[PDB]
């Protein structure tokens, strides 16, 4: 408990995540208190949605803390994949908010509308603070990208509600709210597509996209090593951001210099950017 | 488009998933049509939630179809991880519904309540059909488990709303609805915990839990092989259900019989259940 805090404040990403989480939780707490005091329902609903949103910041901060943990027997690669998972969760978060935003708008279209504005401007201010803090976001790449996208989705929602309120005050358009809600939901989904693509590619054990184009040249150089007969069972995957794991099997001549072949194969794949490589060498019969 | 359908109907899991998805989509469509016809709002909201829920069945069916695709250059392990992802998404789905259920209940507690019942019984019937179809569910293990948990969450929600409606009709308890909603949300989370644990362990490249206990004995037998000096950089992870990948590096004597050591190491880890194994052999200087 106590020891976790000094670890959080040690890192810049973790410190910023913790401060933003505290800000969001305090805002949601004040919203809940004002809603119960001023017997409001939209206030309570917004506070619950804010707690749900802050759960994603919790996930990002937890991933940032856990990623630095040392590897053990159960987690032989360490806990770096947490970073990827955080991003994948954040994106899913966004997809499960945008749709509901969509839903709400449609309901507000099929229903007589019958404050909730000054609170939205304060949320917009907090989102601007988050954008300023995490501007460089969009292993910590996926955590920062997901958190930045989450704050962007919140900012888009605040802009949408503010625009709807102004447009139906000054000019009295009752159709502005559904269109704005649908548009912001579509924008949220579009913004989240690339992060989800990257996270899903990592989680499906896909070949690292930055390494895929250089792999055939690496295979060709390995085949040109003296005493190599063939390559098989090649697998390259992403452990976390810029950390690539490779496994391959070589068939070599029955008298081949395996020490030299091993060192050459490691050199070839180290120049290609593979951090961790396993080369099995099988001596052929003939 | 057309060719996908014959692939879906070929498999039992895919066929059941497709039929359940069609049933859910038809139910949601009829609910939307009746809501727009009978100018209802709860009907429209329930139809939107049903479409959102059917999105999870879509994810499961898509994972089941894609998992059988052959491996290519980009996806060297194939697409089996989709199964795991489906489960992980399903669980997240559940967590993002239960909480909102929780939220709704609290709102209905802090608000004067002011049909939506006969529809709930029909949804309960459909959920019973799903339970009957997918009883054995709880690579297809994680898909079936996640789909079963999703149908269980829907059944729990239907039971909760039905119980609240009966209890506030016959005996007039206005507090029954919040307690029932909170209880079903807690039950949903508890039910989803183990699937999420298994999926997260797979996605963090954790040591397979069924293989972890036998690994030290395997290491000990490898060290007892003649000419072996040490083991290092061992990694064992789960590709999909019951498919384990291992990588290790051996340091051996400078004159060691590498063919025999390689075959013995493969035998040792094949008896332990490792499907795919990479053994790098480095000859020591001295």
């Amino acid at each position, epitope marked *: 408990i106590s020891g976790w805090f000094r670890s959080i404040l040690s890192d810049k990403t973790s410190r910023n995540l913790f401060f933003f989480l505290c800000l969001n939780l305090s805002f949601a707490f004040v919203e809940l208190l004002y809603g119960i005091w001023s017997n409001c329902l939209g206030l309570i609903s917004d506070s619950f949605h804010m707690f749900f949103d802050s759960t994603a910041i919790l996930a990002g901060l937890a991933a940032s803390v856990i990623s630095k943990w040392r590897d053990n027997d159960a987690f032989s690669y360490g806990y770096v994949r947490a970073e990827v998972l955080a991003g994948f969760v954040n994106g899913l978060f966004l997809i499960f908010t945008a749709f509901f935003i969509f839903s709400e708008g449609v309901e507000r279209a099929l229903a007589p509308p019958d404050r909730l504005l000054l609170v939205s401007i304060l949320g917009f201010v907090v989102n601007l603070i988050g954008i300023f803090v995490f501007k460089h976001g969009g292993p910590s790449r996926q955590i920062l990208q997901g958190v930045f996208l989450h704050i962007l989705a919140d900012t888009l929602g605040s802009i949408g509600v503010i625009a709807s309120a102004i447009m139906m005050q000054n000019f009295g358009l009752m159709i502005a709210d559904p269109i704005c809600s649908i548009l912001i939901a579509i924008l949220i989904v579009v913004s989240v597509i690339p992060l989800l693509r990257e996270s899903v590619g990592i989680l499906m054990q896909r070949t690292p996209p930055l390494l895929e184009n250089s792999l055939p040249q690496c295979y060709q150089r390995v085949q*040109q090593l*003296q*005493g190599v*007969y063939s390559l098989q069972e090649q697998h390259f995957w992403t452990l976390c951001s810029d950390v690539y794991v490779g496994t391959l099997k070589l068939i070599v*001549a*029955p*008298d*081949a*210099d*395996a*020490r*030299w072949i*091993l*060192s*050459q194969t*490691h*050199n070839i794949f180290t120049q290609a950017g593979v951090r961790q490589l396993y080369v099995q060498i099988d001596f*052929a019969a*003939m | 488009i057309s060719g996908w359908f014959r692939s879906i109907l070929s498999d039992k899991t895919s066929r059941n998933l497709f039929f359940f998805l069609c049933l859910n989509l038809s139910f949601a469509f009829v609910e939307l049509l009746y809501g727009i016809w009978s100018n209802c709002l709860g009907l429209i909201s329930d139809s939107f939630h049903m479409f959102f829920d059917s999105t999870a069945i879509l994810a499961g069916l898509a994972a089941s179809v894609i998992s059988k695709w052959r491996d290519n250059d980009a996806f060297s392990y194939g697409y089996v991880r989709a199964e795991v992802l489906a489960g992980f998404v399903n669980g997240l789905f559940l967590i993002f519904t239960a909480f909102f259920i929780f939220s709704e209940g609290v709102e209905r507690a802090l608000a004067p309540p002011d049909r939506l019942l006969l529809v709930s019984i029909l949804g309960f019937v459909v959920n019973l059909i799903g339970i009957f179809v997918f009883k054995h569910g709880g690579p297809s293990r994680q898909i079936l488990q996640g789909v079963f948990l999703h149908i269980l969450a829907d059944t729990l929600g239907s039971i909760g709303v039905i119980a609240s409606a009966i209890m506030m009709q016959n005996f007039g308890l206005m507090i029954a609805d919040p307690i029932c909603s909170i209880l079903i949300a807690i039950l949903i989370v508890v039910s989803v915990i183990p699937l999420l644990r298994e999926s997260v362990g797979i996605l963090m490249q954790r040591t397979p839990p069924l293989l972890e206990n036998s690994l030290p004995q395997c290491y000990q037998r490898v060290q007892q092989l003649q000419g072996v000096y040490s083991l290092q950089e061992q990694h064992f992870w789960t590709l999909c259900s019951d498919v384990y990948v291992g990588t290790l590096k051996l340091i051996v004597a400078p004159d060691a019989d590498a063919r025999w050591i390689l075959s013995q190491t493969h035998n040792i880890f094949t008896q332990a259940g490792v499907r795919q194994l990479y053994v790098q052999i*480095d000859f020591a*200087a001295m």
Partner: antibody
Amino acid sequence: EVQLQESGPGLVAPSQSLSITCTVSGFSLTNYAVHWVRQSPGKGLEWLGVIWSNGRTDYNAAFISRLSISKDNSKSQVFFKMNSLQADDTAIYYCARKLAYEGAMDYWGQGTSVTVSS
Amino acid sequence: DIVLTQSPASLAVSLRRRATISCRASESVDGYGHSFMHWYQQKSGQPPKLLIYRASNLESGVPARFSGSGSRTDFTLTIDPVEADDAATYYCQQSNEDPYTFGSGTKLEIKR
């Protein structure tokens, strides 16, 4: 009693082809690579190529266009063929067995002296 | 290709003394803790004979008076004690990069 013996012409006309046969005893070409190396006073020892047990051949870059190495496992012979022989190719040519699992050569043939002149 | 320079070109050593031959590589011939350098001895009218493989390993059948050392780009072959039959030309060869290349050669003549 591992032995390699080279047989070939002692004189080759310029721009012609040189053919050498290396006969091996005491080991099989089904598990040993055989290197071809030439030695001349002007250039010293020069690695020409290697032929592996499955038939894979690895040549020197400077001779890739005019060199061909083949073999027959049944009669245990390795055939070395060079095209476009100029005067600088005058050298003693050796077939050597590859030292197992190493990049060295452990057994060498006696070598055949080949000179290129009219 | 990797260029090997052998210094000195000729070294004069009396009987029972120590002789040292050096081979210098333009680029490193090492890979993962192994130096892929080999030492050969060639007597007059005889094919080269392998003495050392991988820069420090004594080939089976050669006298224990031959020793090898070095790493990266600096390699040394040492004869102690120097005998009469050691008068020959000693070559260094690298197998780290294709093509295989040999050193210029150092000629050992005996002082008596």
